[PDB]
């Protein structure tokens, strides 16, 4: 009875398709977990700079998010967002770098608005180690730092973090990779 045979093959095909997708999503979940940090410090490694720069220039992929990082095991959940070809007043001329508060499982227990000092950095891979960076005290009246209602608050940071020329002509890029670092002050709490 081939109709029966075909129906079962079809069910199996569909279930194999679902499993193949769950498997790929778990691979992603592993990477996220393996690169998580719980002391308020993020190191974000961005490979294939050239291709990714070009995808932002072409408007295919304007921005990238880091993996999440945390101020503590059950603390604020955060990430970074970078625009390789720049955003706002830095579009086309700069790399723009922003900080992001994400909805965390424990937000009901944490102080809001978010008020930890944040430091944004681009790492120098040259032997001089002249890292680019700046820090800010979050503005309490910015919606960037409100208790999250959606998955992610609006990003906040530096549209003109570094000129693209400075970036590309220095020692920040090596083996077609850059390293971004974010430091959130945690000494303040709990």
């Amino acid at each position: 009875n081939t109709g029966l045979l075909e129906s079962q093959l079809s069910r199996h095909d569909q279930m194999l398709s679902v499993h193949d997708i769950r498997l790929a999503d778990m691979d992603l979940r592993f990477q996220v977990l393996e690169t998580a940090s719980y002391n308020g410090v993020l190191i974000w490694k961005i490979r294939d700079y050239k291709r990714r720069k070009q995808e932002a220039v072409m408007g295919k992929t304007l921005s990238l998010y880091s993996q999440p990082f945390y101020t503590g095991y059950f603390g604020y959940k955060m990430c970074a967002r970078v625009y390789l070809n720049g955003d706002g007043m830095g579009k086309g001329t700069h790399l723009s770098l922003f900080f992001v508060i994400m909805r965390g499982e424990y937000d009901a227990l944490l102080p809001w608005p978010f008020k930890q000092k944040v430091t944004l950095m681009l790492m120098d891979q040259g032997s001089s180690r002249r890292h680019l960076g700046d820090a800010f005290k979050p503005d309490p009246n910015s919606s960037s730092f409100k208790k999250p209602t959606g998955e992610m608050n609006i990003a906040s940071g530096c549209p003109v973090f570094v000129a693209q020329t400075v970036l590309e002509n220095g020692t920040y890029i090596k083996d077609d990779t850059i390293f971004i670092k974010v430091i959130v002050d945690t000494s303040d709490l709990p």
């Binding site: 921005s63 967002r81 625009y83 955003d87 706002g88 723009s96 922003f98 992001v100 944004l120 680019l132 960076g133 700046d134 800010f136 503005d139 910015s142 960037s144 959606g150 998955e151 992610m152 608050n153 609006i154 990003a155 906040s156 940071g157 530096c158 549209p159 003109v160 973090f161 570094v162």
Partner: peptide, 14 residues
């Protein structure tokens, strides 16, 4: 380094 005034990126989260 020219970030004396931290501002939001242009619009959209998620």
């Amino acid at each position: 380094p020219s970030c004396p005034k931290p501002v939001q990126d242009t619009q959209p989260p998620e």
